[PDB]
Amino acid sequence: VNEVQEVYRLQGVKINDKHFEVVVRQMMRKVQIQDSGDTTFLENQLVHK
Amino acid sequence: MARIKDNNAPKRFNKISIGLASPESILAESRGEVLKPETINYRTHKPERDGLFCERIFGPVKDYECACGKYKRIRYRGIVCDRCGVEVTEKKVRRDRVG
Amino acid sequence: SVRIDGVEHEFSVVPGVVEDVTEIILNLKQVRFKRQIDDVESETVSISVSGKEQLTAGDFQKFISGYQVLNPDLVICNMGPKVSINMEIVIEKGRGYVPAEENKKSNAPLGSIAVDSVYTPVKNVKYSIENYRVEQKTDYEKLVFEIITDGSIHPKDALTEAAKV
Amino acid sequence: MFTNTIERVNFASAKNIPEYPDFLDIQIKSFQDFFQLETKSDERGNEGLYNTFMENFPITDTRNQFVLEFLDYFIDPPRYSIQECIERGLTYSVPLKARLKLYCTDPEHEDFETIVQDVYLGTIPYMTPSGTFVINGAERVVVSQLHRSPGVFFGQSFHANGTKLYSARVIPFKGSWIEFATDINGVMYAYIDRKKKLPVTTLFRAIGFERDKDILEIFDLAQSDYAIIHNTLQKDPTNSEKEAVEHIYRQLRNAEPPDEETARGIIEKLFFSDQRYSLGEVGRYRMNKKLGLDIGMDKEVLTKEDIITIIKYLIELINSKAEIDDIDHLSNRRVRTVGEQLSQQFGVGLARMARTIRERMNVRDNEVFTPIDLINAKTLSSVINSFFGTNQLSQFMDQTNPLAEITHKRRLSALGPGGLSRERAGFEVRDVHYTHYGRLCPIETPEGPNIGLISSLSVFAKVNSMGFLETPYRKVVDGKVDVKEHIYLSAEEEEGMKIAQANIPLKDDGTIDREKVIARDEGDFPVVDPVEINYTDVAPNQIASISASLIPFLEHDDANRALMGSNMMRQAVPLLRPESPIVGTGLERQVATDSRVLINAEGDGVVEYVDAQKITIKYDRTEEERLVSFEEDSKTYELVKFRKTNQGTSINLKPIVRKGDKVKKGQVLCEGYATEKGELALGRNMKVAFMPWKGYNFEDAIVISEKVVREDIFTSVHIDEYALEVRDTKLGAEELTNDIPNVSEEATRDLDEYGMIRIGAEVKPGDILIGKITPKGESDPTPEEKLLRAIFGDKAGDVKDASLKASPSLRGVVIDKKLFSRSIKDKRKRSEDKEAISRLEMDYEVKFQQLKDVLIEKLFGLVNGKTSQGVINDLGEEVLPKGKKYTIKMLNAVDDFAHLVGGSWTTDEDTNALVADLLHNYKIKLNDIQGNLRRDKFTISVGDELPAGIMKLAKVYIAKKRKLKVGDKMAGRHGNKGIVARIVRQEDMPFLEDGTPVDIVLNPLGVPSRMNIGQIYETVLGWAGLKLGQKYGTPIFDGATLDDINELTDKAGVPRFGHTYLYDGGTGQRFDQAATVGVIYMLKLGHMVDDKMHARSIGPYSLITQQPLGGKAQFGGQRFGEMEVWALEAYGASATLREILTVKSDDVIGRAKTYESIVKGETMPEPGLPESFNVLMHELKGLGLDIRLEE
Amino acid sequence: SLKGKQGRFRQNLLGKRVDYSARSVIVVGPEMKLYECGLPKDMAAELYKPFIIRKLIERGIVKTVKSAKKIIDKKEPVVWDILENVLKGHPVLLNRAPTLHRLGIQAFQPKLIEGKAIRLHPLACTAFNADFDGDQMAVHLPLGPEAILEAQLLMLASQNILNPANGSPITVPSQDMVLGLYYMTKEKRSTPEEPVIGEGLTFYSSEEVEIAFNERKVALNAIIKVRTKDFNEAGELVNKIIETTVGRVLFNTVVPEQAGYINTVLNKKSLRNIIGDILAVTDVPTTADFLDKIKTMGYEFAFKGGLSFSLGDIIIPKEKHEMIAEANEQVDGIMMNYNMGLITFNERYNQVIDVWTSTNAMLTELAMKRIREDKQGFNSVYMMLDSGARGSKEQIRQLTGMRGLMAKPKKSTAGGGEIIENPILSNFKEGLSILEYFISTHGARKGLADTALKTADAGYLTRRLVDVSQDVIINTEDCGTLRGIEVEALKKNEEVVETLGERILGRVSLHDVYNPLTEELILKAGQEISEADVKKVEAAPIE
Ligand SMILES: [Mg+2]
Q: How far apart are CA E453 and CA D450, in angstroms?
A: 11
Rounded-to-integer distance, Cα B32 and Cα D301, Å? 68
Which residue does chain C place closest to D650, by CA atoms? C11
Q: Cα(D909)–Cα(D905) distance, rounded to whole angstroms?
A: 9
CA-nearest residue to E464 within chain A is: A23
Q: Torsion-angle region of residue D189: left (phi > 0), alpha (psi -120 to 50) or beta?
A: beta
Cβ within 8 Å, pair B2-D1186: no
Residues D1121-1151: b if buried by 16+ CB within 10 A, e if exposed: eebbbbbbebbebebbbbbbbbbbbbbbbbb
Q: What three-state secondary structure class fits A41?
A: coil
Nearest residue to C3 via CA among C48, C41, C42: C48
**Partners of E496 in the β-ladder:** E491
Q: What are phi and psi of D74, to 5 degrees?
A: -130, 145
D416 touches D425 (CB < 8 A)? no
* Closest chain C residue to D957, measured at CA: C11
CA dist D231 and D223 (Å) reads 12
How many Å apart are CA D154 and CA D172, to the nearest integer?
15
CA D829 – CA D815 distance, rounded (Å)? 33
Q: Which residues contact E373 (CB under 8 A, 6 or more apart)?
A: none
CA distance D332 to D149: 5
Q: Return phi, psi of residue E373, to 5°.
A: -75, -15
Question: What's the CA-to-centroid distance between D1007 and ligand 1, angstroms?
Answer: 16
Between CA E290 and CA C35 the distance in angstroms is 55
Surrounding residues of ion ligand 1, Cβ less than 5 A: E 131, 133, 135
**CA–CA distance, D792 with D663 (Å, rounded to integer):** 67
Question: Phi, psi at residue E27, to the nearest 5°?
Answer: -125, 160
Residue E466 sits at the chain A interface (C-beta within 8 Å): no
Determine the straight-line distance between the first and last CA of chain B, rounded to whole angstroms. Answer: 31
For residues D573, D575, D578, D582, the Cα torsion angle rounded to the nearest 10 degrees is -50
Helices and strands (H, E) in chain E, number of each type: 19, 14
The technique by which this structure was obtained is cryo-EM
- Please tell me whether B81 is known to bind a ligand: yes
| Dihedral sign (CA E237, E239, E244, E248) | positive
DSSP string, D379-439: HHHHHHHHHHHH-TTEEEP--SSHHHHHHHHTEEES-STTS--TTT--HHHHS--GGGTTT
Helix, strand or coil, per DSSP, at residue D31: helix
For E276-291, the DSSP string reads HHHHHHS-HHHHHHHH
Q: Is residue E261 classed as helix, strand or coil in its secondary structure?
A: coil
Q: Phi and psi dihedrals of D394, rounded to 5?
A: -95, 85
HSE-CB of D589 using CA atoms within 13 angstroms: 15
- CA D574 to CA D674: how far, in whole Å? 5
Would you call B3 and D1149 a contact, using CB atoms and an 8 Å cutoff? yes
| Cβ atoms < 10 Å from Cβ of B43 | 7
Q: How far is CA E244 from the centre of its chain?
A: 27
Alpha helical stretches, state H, D326-370: 338-363
* Phi then psi dihedrals of residue D952, to 5 deg: -140, 145
How far apart are the C-alpha atoms of D380 and E43, rounded to whole Å? 53
Nearest partner of C142 among C155, C154, C129, judged by Cα: C129
* CA E131, chain centre distance (Å): 12
CB contact (8 A) between residue D700 and residue E27: no
Q: State which H helix or E strand residue D591 sits in.
A: helix D588-595
Q: How many CB atoms lie within 10 A of CB D629?
A: 17
User: What are the CA-CA distances from residue B59 to residues B66, B71, D83, D730, D943 (Å)?
Assistant: 9, 14, 53, 25, 48
Paired with C122 in beta bridges are C149
Find the radius of gyration of the CA atoms of chain B: 16
How far, in Å, are D6, D95, D382, D953 from residue D79 at the CA level? 41, 8, 18, 19
Please check whether residue B1 touches D, CB under 8 A.
no
Residue D863 CA to ligand 1 center (angstroms) comes to 76
Between CA D473 and CA D395, with CA D433 as vertex, the angle to 5 degrees is 95
Longest dimension (CA), chain B: 48
Count CB-CB contacts under 10 A for residue E541.
9
- The CA distance from D1033 to D8, in Å, is 6
CA-nearest of B90, B84, B88, B86 to B6 is B90
Candidates A15, D876, D436, C40; CA nearest to E465 is A15
> In angstroms, rounded to a whole number, what is the distance separating the alpha carbons of residues D169 and D180?
7
E366 and E317 Cβ atoms separated by less than 8 Å: yes
Give the three-class secondary structure for D878: strand
E517 exposure class (CB count in 10 Å sphere: 0-12, 13-18, 19+):
exposed
Q: Name which of D609, D709, D959 is nearest C11 (Cβ-Cβ).
A: D959
Sheet holding D138-142, edge to edge: D133-135, D138-142, D394-396
Alpha-carbon span D900 to D878, nearest angstrom = 9
Interchain contact, D717 vs C11, CB within 8 Å: yes
Q: How far apart are CA D890 and CA D612, in angstroms?
A: 50
Alpha carbon D1179 to its chain centroid, in Å, reads 47
Q: Do E472 and A27 touch (CB under 8 A)?
A: no
Q: Angle E334-E335-E341 (CA atoms, 0-180°, nearest 5)?
A: 90
DSSP E308: -
Touch C-D: 3+ C-beta pairs under 8 A: yes
Q: Which amino acid is at B32?
A: G
Residue D144 has a CB neighbour count (10 Å cut-off) of 25
CB < 8 Å to E462, chain A: none
Chain D touches chain B, with at least 3 Cβ pairs below 8 Å, answer yes
Q: Are D414 and D384 in contact (CB under 8 A)?
A: no
Selection from D1191, D61, D815, E523 nearest residue C10 by Cα: D815
D1174/B10 Cβ within 8 A? no
Q: What's chain A's Rg over C-alpha atoms?
A: 17
Task: Please state, in angstroms and rounded to a whole number, the distance separating the CA atoms of residues D696 and C121.
Answer: 29
Output Rg (C-alpha) for chain E, integer angstroms.
Answer: 30
With helix as H, strand as E and coil as C, how does D910-952 read? HHHHHHHHHHHHHHHHHHHHHHHHHHHHHHHHCECCCCCCEEE
Long-range contacts of E535-538 (CB under 8 A, 24+ apart): E535/E501, E537/E500, E537/E501, E537/E504, E537/E513, E538/E499, E538/E500, E538/E501
**Residue D555 is nearest to which of E57, E93, E432, comparing CB atoms?**
E432
Buried b (16+ CB within 10 A) or exposed e, A9-47: beeeeeebbebbeeeeeeeeeeeeeeeeeeeeeeeeeee
| Contact in structure between D613 and D638 (CB atoms under 8 Å) | yes
Measured between alpha carbons, how far is D448 from D430 in angstroms, rounded to an integer? 12
Residue D228 host element (H or E):
helix D227-234
Q: How far apart are the C-alpha atoms of D604 and D789, rounded to whole Å?
A: 71
Helical H segments across D254-320, by residue range: 260-271, 280-291, 304-318
**Chain B neighbors of D1168, CB-CB under 8 A:** 10
Residue D540: cis peptide before it, omega within 30 degrees of 0: no
Alpha-carbon torsion E94, E97, E102, E103, what sign? negative
> Rounded distance, CA D283 to CA D285, Å?
5
Q: Taking the mean position of all CA atoms in its chain, how far away is CA E499?
A: 23
| CB of D571 closer than 8 Å to CB of D674 | no
Query: Which residues in chain C have Cβ-Cβ distances shorter than 8 Å to D717?
Result: 11, 22
**Using the beta-carbon criterion (under 8 Å), do D1143 and E435 form an inter-chain contact?**
no
Residues D420 and D429: their CA atoms lie apart, in Å, by: 9
Label the pairing between strands E202-203 and E223-231. Answer: parallel
SS3 of residue D560 by DSSP: helix
Contact A29/E at CB under 8 A: no
Pick from D782, D1180, D1191: CB nearest B73? D782
Cis amide prior to D505 (ω within 30 degrees): no
C-alpha to C-alpha distance for D929 and D1150, rounded to whole angstroms: 70
Cα-based distances in Å from D316 to D155, D235, D302, D311: 13, 21, 21, 9
Bridge partners, residue D59, by sequence = D68
> D557 alpha carbon to ligand 1 midpoint, in Å?
20
Cα dihedral sign, D439-D442-D446-D448: positive
Instruction: Report DSSP state, residue D1142.
Output: I
Tell me if B68 is assigned to a ligand binding site.
yes
Residues in contact with D589: Cβ distance below 8 Å, sequence separation at least 6, in sequence order: D6, D678, D679, D680
Residue D522 CB-half CA count within 13 A:
10
Strands (DSSP E) along D1013-1110, which ranges? 1032-1033, 1059-1060, 1075-1084, 1094-1096
Element (DSSP H or E) covering residue E482: none
In sequence order, the β-bridge partners of residue C79 are C17
Determine whether the annotation assigns residue B84 to a binding site: yes
CA angle E269, E275, E278 (to 5 degrees): 140
By the 10 Å C-beta count (0-12 exposed, 13-18 middle, 19+ buried), D914 is classed as buried
Alpha-carbon torsion E40, E42, E48, E53, what sign?
positive
Angle between helices E49-59 and E65-73 (to 10 degrees): 120
What DSSP line would sit under D640-707, residue for residue? PEEEE-TTSBEEEEEE---TT-EE-TT-B-EEESSEETTEE--SEEEEEEES--TTTT-TTEEEEEHH
Alpha carbon distance D435, D427 (integer Å): 17
